[PDB]
Structure formats: structure tokens, C-alpha cells
Amino acid sequence: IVGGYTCGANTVPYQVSLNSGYHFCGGSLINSQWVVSAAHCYKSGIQVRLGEDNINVVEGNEQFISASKSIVHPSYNSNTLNNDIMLIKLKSAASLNSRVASISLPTSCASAGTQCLISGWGNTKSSGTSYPDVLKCLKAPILSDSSCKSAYPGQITSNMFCAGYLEGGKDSCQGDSGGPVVCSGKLQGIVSWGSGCAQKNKPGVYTKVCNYVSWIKQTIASN
Ligand SMILES: NC(=[NH2+])c1ccc2[nH]c(-c3ccc[nH]c3=O)nc2c1
Numbered sequence: 001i002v003g004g005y006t007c008g009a010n011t012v013p014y015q016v017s018l019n020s021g022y023h024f025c026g027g028s029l030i031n032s033q034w035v036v037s038a039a040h041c042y043k044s045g046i047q048v049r050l051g052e053d054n055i056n057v058v059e060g061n062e063q064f065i066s067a068s069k070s071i072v073h074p075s076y077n078s079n080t081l082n083n084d085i086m087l088i089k090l091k092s093a094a095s096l097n098s099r100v101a102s103i104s105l106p107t108s109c110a111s112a113g114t115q116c117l118i119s120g121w122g123n124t125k126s127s128g129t130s131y132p133d134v135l136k137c138l139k140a141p142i143l144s145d146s147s148c149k150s151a152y153p154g155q156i157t158s159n160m161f162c163a164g165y166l167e168g169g170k171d172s173c174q175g176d177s178g179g180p181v182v183c184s185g186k187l188q189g190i191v192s193w194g195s196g197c198a199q200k201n202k203p204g205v206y207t208k209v210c211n212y213v214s215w216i217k218q219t220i221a222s223n
């Protein structure tokens with residue numbers, strides 16, 4: 001996250017870190033047994049780490065649970081990143097408490113102009129590399145589809161939306177992929193892609209979760 005701030009320990013209780021011997025993507029807890037992340041974060045051998053703040057220090061509130069199965073969306077296209085969403089089932093149910101909680105799925109899609117909270121342990125420099133150990137946060141508004149499409153001609157589908165600042169300076173970045181974009185208490189997006197990080201007229205692109213609620217609900221109830 002570039003131009004964001006330190007969230008504070010466990011203030012984003014639904015945020016998860018996917019680890020395959022190191023942190024490689026974020027995710028969101030939607031109930032005690034399931035996590036939603038981005039399809040491009042798919043890997044074999046994932047351990048889900050809940051209740052994290054510093055990912056390099058065991059501070060006492062973490063739960064490390066292995067995944068039993070991963071399901072990438074049936075229409076995910078790795079070339080365009082259309083339908084960039086995946087579900088991960090935990091081998092054991094997590095224990096929900098004040099530090100580990102799930103986030104609600106949306107009942108409708110959010111309007112352009114709605115402010116959201118984006119979080120993750122990704123790179124904090126637009127030009128350079130600095131990976132934080134504690135969770136970073138960024139409040140950013142959903143942008144109009146017209147500004148999103150003018151920034152990325154022929155690359156935005158109806159399953160994506162842009163959020164951020166066209167001026168640049170504030171954005172999600174590599175390492176944040178798969179993490180949550182929460183607006184008005186609902187999970188509305190997943191960090192998917194962008195052009196570099198915090199560049200002018202290159203906002204971040206997020207998977208539009210309101211278009212996948214029926215698929216998520218049906219898939220978790222049958223697995
Ligand atoms: N500007 C953004 N909002 C953004 C977000 C996630 C990204 N993830 C990546 C990325 C780069 C290289 C390899 N893997 C990634 O996920 N670039 C990204 C850019």
C-alpha cells in the first residue's frame with residue numbers, strides 16, 4: 001500500500017495473509033471455514049494466517065490454518081485477469097473473536113464516490129521497494145467507470161472497477177493482491193491489478209465482488 005497508514009493491530013479483523021513459506025497475497029475471511037482472495041494468487045500449499053498484524057513476529061493473536069481446497073472461478077482468464085477471484089476452504093474452522101472476524105458480502109454494488117478501506121502488507125513505494133511487516137491501510141473512493149476505462153482502454157470488463165486517486169500518490173501495490181476493499185461494511189472488491197503503483201492516471205483495478213455473490217454462496221454450500 002503506497003501513501004497509506006499503519007492500520008493498528010487487529011483493527012482489520014477479516015484480513016488474512018496467505019503464506020507458502022512467506023507472505024505472497026492477502027485475502028478476506030467471509031465465515032469460519034472460507035476465505036476469498038484473487039485467482040492470480042492461486043498456489044498449491046497455502047497456509048492461511050489470521051489475526052496478524054506484524055507478519056514476522058508471533059504477537060499472540062494469530063491462527064495459522066492450512067487450506068483443504070482452493071477453487072478458482074470457472075471463467076478466470078489469466079491473460080486479462082477477468083473474474084479474478086478464488087475461494088479457499090480452511091482445514092479447520094477458525095475461532096472468531098475480536099481479533100478474527102469475517103466480513104459481510106454485499107447485497108448490492110456500491111456507487112462511484114463511495115469511500116472504501118483497502119489494506120495489505122504490500123510494497124509501500126511507487127518507485128522503489130520497501131515491504132512493511134505490519135498492516136497498512138488506505139481509504140480511497142470508487143472512481144467512475146468512465147475514468148477507469150479511459151485509463152485502461154479495452155482492458156476493463158464489467159467485473160472490474162477502479163478505486164484510488166488519478167493524481168497518484170495513494171494506491172494498493174504488489175503484495176496487496178487478493179486483499180479486501182471494504183465499503184460501507186461490505187466486501188466490494190479484491191486487489192487485482194494496476195499499472196505500477198500510485199502513478200498518475202493509473203488507479204488500481206479491483207475485482208467487483210457484488211457480481212459473484214451467488215457463485216460464492218452456492219460454491220461454499222456445496223463444498
Ligand atoms: N497498482 C495496483 N493497484 C496494483 C495492485 C496489485 C498489483 N499486483 C501487481 C503485481 C505485479 C507483479 C506480480 N504480481 C502482482 O500481483 N501489480 C499490482 C499493482
Ligand SMILES: [Ca+2]
Pocket residue numbers: 052053054055056057058059062
Ligand atoms: Ca504476527
Ligand SMILES: [Mg+2]
Pocket residue numbers: 025026027119120121175176177178179180191
Ligand atoms: Mg491485502
